[PDB]
Structure formats: C-alpha cells, structure tokens
Design an enzyme around this catalytic site. Structure first.
Site, PDB file in Angstrom:
ATOM      1  CE  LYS A 100      -4.094  -2.082   2.267  1.00 59.89           C
ATOM      2  NZ  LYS A 100      -3.742  -3.184   2.073  1.00 59.89           N
ATOM      3  CD  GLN A 146     -12.242  -7.315   5.750  1.00 57.73           C
ATOM      4  OE1 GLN A 146     -12.397  -5.519   5.757  1.00 57.73           O
ATOM      5  NE2 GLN A 146     -10.689  -7.242   5.026  1.00 57.73           N
TER       6      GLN A 146
HETATM    7  O1  LIG Z   1      -9.932  -2.571   1.231  1.00 59.17           O
HETATM    8  C1  LIG Z   1      -8.451  -3.955   1.438  1.00 59.17           C
HETATM    9  C2  LIG Z   1      -7.444  -3.736   1.100  1.00 59.17           C
HETATM   10  C3  LIG Z   1      -6.222  -4.304   1.748  1.00 59.17           C
HETATM   11  O2  LIG Z   1      -5.499  -4.815   0.844  1.00 59.17           O
HETATM   12  N1  LIG Z   1      -6.669  -4.966   2.534  1.00 59.17           N
HETATM   13  C4  LIG Z   1      -5.369  -6.697   2.886  1.00 59.17           C
HETATM   14  O3  LIG Z   1      -6.654  -8.097   2.056  1.00 59.17           O
HETATM   15  C5  LIG Z   1      -6.124  -8.849   3.321  1.00 59.17           C
HETATM   16  C6  LIG Z   1      -7.770  -9.028   3.800  1.00 59.17           C
HETATM   17  O4  LIG Z   1      -7.678 -10.689   4.270  1.00 59.17           O
HETATM   18  P1  LIG Z   1      -9.331 -11.913   5.695  1.00 59.17           P
HETATM   19  O5  LIG Z   1      -9.391 -12.872   4.323  1.00 59.17           O
HETATM   20  O6  LIG Z   1      -7.711 -12.211   6.384  1.00 59.17           O
HETATM   21  O7  LIG Z   1      -9.761 -10.339   6.385  1.00 59.17           O
HETATM   22  C7  LIG Z   1      -5.709  -7.980   4.252  1.00 59.17           C
HETATM   23  O8  LIG Z   1      -4.274  -8.721   3.672  1.00 59.17           O
HETATM   24  C8  LIG Z   1      -5.427  -6.792   4.237  1.00 59.17           C
HETATM   25  O9  LIG Z   1      -4.395  -6.412   4.279  1.00 59.17           O
HETATM   26  C9  LIG Z   1      -8.611  -5.417   3.018  1.00 59.17           C
HETATM   27  O10 LIG Z   1      -8.305  -6.250   3.742  1.00 59.17           O
HETATM   28  N2  LIG Z   1      -9.073  -4.861   2.979  1.00 59.17           N
END
Ligand SMILES: O=c1cc(O)n([C@@H]2O[C@H](COP(=O)(O)O)[C@@H](O)[C@H]2O)c(=O)[nH]1
Ligand SMILES: O=c1cc(O)n([C@@H]2O[C@H](COP(=O)(O)O)[C@@H](O)[C@H]2O)c(=O)[nH]1
Lengths: 217, 218
Positions: free
Chosen positions: B65, B178
């Site tokens: 990022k 999420q």
């Molecule tokens: O808007 C965004 C951008 C991202 O890169 N991410 C990244 O995507 C991943 C989501 O992981 P998770 O499936 O455990 O929630 C993490 O590495 C996070 O930093 C996110 O969740 N939201």
C-alpha cells in the site's frame, strides 16, 4: 519527545554501509533518526537495532501505515518488536485504522505519529481537502504526535492551530522539497531533513549549516 | 492480465515463517497467486519473497500500500521488484504524481502496479470512499490496468468496475472474515483475495477447496 537541535534525520539511503557512515558523520548534531521503507526493505528490520546499538538514537519508523485495523495491528507489532520508538500512520484510512495502531503503541510503550497533510504536489488532490478533519480526528482519538508539510507553511500553521501547542508536530519537506528550516520551526517542534543532508558532499557540514540557520530557535 | 488459478488469491498474513510456509504449501494445489504484505515481510524480511518463489510455483503480489511522496515511492518499488515481487499495490489517495512514480519504476523494471481505490474496512467511509471514484478515474487516465476494490461493498465494487472498464484487472479483499461473499464479489472482480478464512482454518486446504467449490460455475 526531546529532539536534539529540533532536527530529525530522514535516513533514506538504501545501503547499510552508507546509511551507517552518514548517520555517524552527523551523530553529534542529532539524536533522532527517521527510518523508512527505502532502508528497511533494502537491509532488513535488524537495521533498527543496529542504529540503537551504534548511536543510541531514538528511531521513528516512517511506514505510513495505511491498512485495515487488523493488518495495522500486525504491522505495528512487528515494527515495535524491531525496536522502533514510534511509528508514522496515515489518517486518511479512517479512525478505526488509527486506533488499531494506538492500541499496540500503548501496549508496547511507544508513540504514534499521525500524518495529516503530505508535502508533495499530489497531496493537493485528495489529502489536503481532508487534512483538517483528519487532524480533528486525531484530537478526538487522543493523538499527541502529528506530521505536517513544510512545503505549505499556511497549512502547517493551520494544523498547529487544530492540535494545540501541547501536541508534538514534526515536518518534512525541508530543503530538497523547498521548505525553509526556520519558517517551518515557527509551527513545528522539529524538522525532518533527508537529502539536503545525506546527499550532500559533506553531510556533517550540511547539518551544521542547517542548525546555524536556526540557532536562535 | 495475470492468470490467477481458481480466481483465488491467498493473503498470507501469518507472521511466522514456518507457519506461513506450511499453510501456503498446503493450499498450493488450489492457488498459484499469493499476496504477501508487511505483517510477514516486516517479521521475516524481503527474502521471504525469494523463499516462496523457491518453494512454490506462485506469483507474488507485494501488498505494501505504497503511500509516500514520489521520490520515496520510487525507492520502495525498486527495492520490492529487486526482491522478486511480480507486482506491488499502491494507494491512490496520495495523488497522481505518487502513483506515476510507481508506474514509472514498474515500466522500467518490467513489473506491474495495482492501484488501491476504496478500502474494505469501516473506516474507509470517512475519507477514502468520497474520493474513490476520482481515484479510479485518475488511475484510468494514468494508464493503470490493475486495481483493488472492496468486497464488503458490492455497490461500490460494481461502480469501480464500471469506471475501469471490463478490460482492466480487478482483485478484491474482504471476502470471508470481513463479510464479503465469494460468488457475489466475483460478479465484478476477476479474483478474490482471502486471508483468515483460509490461513486460520484447522484445514486451510479444505477451506480453500470449499471456497472454490462454491464458485465452481464461475
Ligand atoms: O481494502 C482493503 C485492502 C487490502 O489490501 N486488504 C488486505 O487484504 C487482506 C484481507 O485478509 P482477510 O481475508 O483475512 O480479511 C489483508 O492482507 C488486508 O491487509 C483488505 O482487507 N482491505
Ligand atoms: O508529507 C510527507 C511525509 C513524509 O514522511 N515525508 C518523508 O520525509 C522525508 C523527506 O526527505 P527529503 O528531505 O529528502 O525530501 C522522506 O523520507 C519522505 O518519505 C515527506 O517527504 N513528505
């Protein structure tokens, strides 16, 4: 935070040998070094402990943390485990992402610096218009350390007005980007200087010169 | 565009080298594209990219990022590509010059830039959401071909897809933990990013297989 000579060295050289040598050449003028990804991604996080071992300087990890809360927590934990005293976090991603950082900082005895407005031209596109609100958000969250632009004194002054005289404010964009050391210190507690020092033929003389220009401050 | 196996990208955010390698290896037959971010890189070093390439036949997207000034962004991209990353994710909110700096390095080094528009977390609504459409339009104007959009907001992901066009490549995080749905997200995104739903499962391979089974027709 007591920054020697109100001067923070932005050590963005990407070679361990050069970074250590240059920092050593100006060690008598500073006691606070900002280490960012250029150096960390080139030499590893072990460089932070190396700096503390060789200079005993305080280390601000300029990682402009800008992820979701869960990831921000992990980034801060890994950063403080490496020995960083503070970390710089973007405010644009929102309050929850900043709070995640504040939590880890409190747990490990460190500080969070909230980056409001940036110093480069592109900052005018989206960041500038949200900067005042980001600063108010920091105030609401109890943030006490901030980062504002040397390249826009009027904006830096506004940031100072919002956060108050008790908050700590550091400012990059001095020298190479056009910011003036003395003018910036009218509002910021300390100035961040990178290239004007580490790219100078004589880094020590460069640092000495900057300090001479602000000796009355 | 990169050919992402099963339209599934693993967000490997475990911070232990041993665990990260174990889990990635267990889902290797289902995923050939791995997103490595700072949680793992700051814990194990940039050499982790080299180890993943050696151990698995996986493409690597460095989720850093990038959000600094142009000069610093250039250095970050150079170090990242030098380490073996196929692509890097960059924030669009810092402006056009900061994004262009990354694009220039990617072009010079033969790699790719992914532009992060709107984010998936609640806080994204405070400042990012209001600038997201313009950030996306800026990306199109700059020639950006790869984008990142939120699975947690289908309506927003849909609009982002419209702005960038069908030819652009779009990946989307926020699936699973999420709240995002795999199938619904794939209505707009070329590939979904999944982290915890897979790497925290008792059987990561079964978790990945389950997700793929639910989107088999896609
Ligand atoms: O808007 C965004 C951008 C991202 O890169 N991410 C990244 O995507 C991943 C989501 O992981 P998770 O499936 O455990 O929630 C993490 O590495 C996070 O930093 C996110 O969740 N939201
Ligand atoms: O708005 C901002 C925020 C920063 O942290 N910085 C950082 O401060 C330093 C400025 O260095 P320089 O004096 O060479 O321009 C860099 O490490 C840069 O990434 C900046 O220039 N502008």
């Amino acid at each position: 935070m007591d920054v020697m000579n109100r001067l923070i060295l932005a050590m963005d050289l990407m070679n361990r040998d050069d970074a250590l040598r240059v920092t050593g050449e100006v060690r008598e003028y500073i006691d606070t070094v900002k280490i960012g990804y250029p150096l960390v991604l080139s030499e590893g996080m072990d460089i932070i402990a190396e700096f503390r071992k060789r200079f005993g300087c305080r280390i601000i990890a300029d990682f402009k943390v800008a992820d979701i809360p869960e990831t921000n927590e992990k980034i801060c934990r890994a950063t403080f485990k490496a020995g960083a005293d503070a970390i710089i976090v973007h405010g644009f991603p929102g309050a929850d992402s900043v709070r995640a950082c504040l939590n880890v900082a409190e747990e490990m005895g460190r500080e969070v610096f909230l980056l409001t407005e940036m110093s480069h031209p592109g900052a005018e596109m989206f960041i500038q218009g949200a900067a005042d609100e980001i600063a108010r958000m920091g105030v609401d969250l109890g943030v006490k350390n901030y980062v504002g632009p040397s390249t826009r004194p009027e904006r830096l002054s506004r940031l100072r007005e919002i956060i108050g005289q008790d908050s700590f404010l550091i400012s990059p964009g001095v020298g190479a980007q056009g910011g003036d050391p003395g003018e910036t210190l009218r509002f910021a507690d300390a100035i961040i200087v990178g290239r004007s020092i580490y790219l100078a033929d004589n880094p020590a003389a460069a640092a000495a010169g900057i300090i001479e220009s602000i000796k009355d401050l």
